[PDB]
C-alpha cells in the first residue's frame, strides 16, 4: 500500500498491525495463562474419548469456525487487505485462515505438559481420539510445540500472522504485484520490530516453508474422509463457512 514506505510509515504499520490483532485476538492471553493448572481429569478425558466420531467432529468444526471468524475480522482490519481485489481477498483467506488459527494455537498451548485449551480446560492430544486422525492431531501438537520454543510476544504474533495471511505466493492471485507490495511492507514492519527488540534470531526458527500448508492440506483430507463416512452430519450440522473454506 505504498512503494518506498518511509521509516515513519513502517513504524505506523507496526502500530496498526498490533492494534488489529489486539482487537481480534479472540482469547485474552492472561485468561489463558492463568488457567494452565485447570486440566481435564482422567474421567473427563474418558468422556471425550467415548464421544461419537460425528459429535466430536461437529464440536471441533464449530470451535474452529469461531476461531476462523476472528481471523476474518483480523483480515478486514488489516492495513491494505480490504484494498485488494475481491478475488485476492478470498484466495488469501481460503489459503491462510486455518494457517493463522494453527499459529494462534501456540497461545493456548502449554509446552510443559503438552496440553491445549479446549472447552474450558487444558487437555492433551488424547482428548481428540474420537476424531480418528491421531497422527494429524499429533502433528498439530508438534507444530504448536515448535512454536512454543520461540516464545512469541503478542506483538510478534500480530506481525507474523499478518504475514501468514498476506502471502504473495498463493496460487490464483489475480493482482500478485499488489500482494507482493503489501507483503514486503509487512515484512519491513516485522523486521523493524524484531530489530528494535533484538529478536531477529527468531527469523531462522520460524516454521519451514510449506509446513502450515501441509497441516492444512491434511485437515482437508481428513475432512473429506469424515464427510465420506458421515455425509448427512456435515450437511445438517457443520457451519456453512467451514464447508466453503474446506470442502
Amino acid at each position: 500500500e505504498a512503494p518506498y514506505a518511509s521509516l515513519t510509515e513502517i513504524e505506523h504499520l507496526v502500530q496498526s498491525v498490533c492494534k488489529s490483532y489486539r482487537e481480534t485476538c479472540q482469547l485474552r492471553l492472561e485468561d489463558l495463562l492463568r488457567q494452565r493448572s485447570n486440566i481435564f481429569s482422567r474421567e473427563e478425558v474418558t468422556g471425550y474419548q467415548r464421544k461419537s466420531m460425528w459429535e466430536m467432529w461437529e464440536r471441533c468444526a464449530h470451535h474452529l469456525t469461531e476461531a476462523i471468524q476472528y481471523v476474518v475480522e483480523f483480515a478486514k482490519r488489516l492495513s491494505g487487505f480490504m484494498e485488494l481485489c475481491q478475488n485476492d481477498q478470498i484466495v488469501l483467506l481460503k489459503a491462510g485462515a486455518m494457517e493463522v488459527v494453527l499459529v494462534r494455537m501456540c497461545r493456548a498451548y502449554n509446552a510443559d505438559n503438552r496440553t491445549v485449551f479446549f472447552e474450558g480446560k487444558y487437555g492433551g492430544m488424547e482428548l481428540f481420539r474420537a476424531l480418528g486422525c491421531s497422527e494429524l492431531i499429533s502433528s498439530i501438537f508438534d507444530f504448536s510445540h515448535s512454536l512454543s520454543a520461540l516464545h512469541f510476544s503478542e506483538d510478534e504474533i500480530a506481525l507474523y500472522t499478518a504475514l501468514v495471511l498476506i502471502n504473495a505466493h498463493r496460487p490464483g492471485l489475480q493482482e500478485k504485484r499488489k500482494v507482493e507490495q503489501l507483503q514486503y511492507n509487512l515484512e519491513l514492519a516485522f523486521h523493524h520490530h524484531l530489530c528494535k527488540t533484538h529478536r531477529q534470531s527468531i527469523l531462522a526458527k520460524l516454521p519451514p516453508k510449506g509446513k502450515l500448508r501441509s497441516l492444512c492440506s491434511q485437515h482437508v483430507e481428513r475432512l473429506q474422509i469424515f464427510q465420506h463416512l458421515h455425509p448427512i452430519v456435515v450437511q445438517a450440522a457443520f457451519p456453512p463457512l467451514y464447508k466453503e473454506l474446506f470442502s
Partner: peptide, 13 residues
Amino acid sequence: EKHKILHRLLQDS
C-alpha cells in the same frame, strides 16, 4: 469452489 458466504462476510458492515 464455493465462496458466496466468504464474499458476504467480507462485505458485511
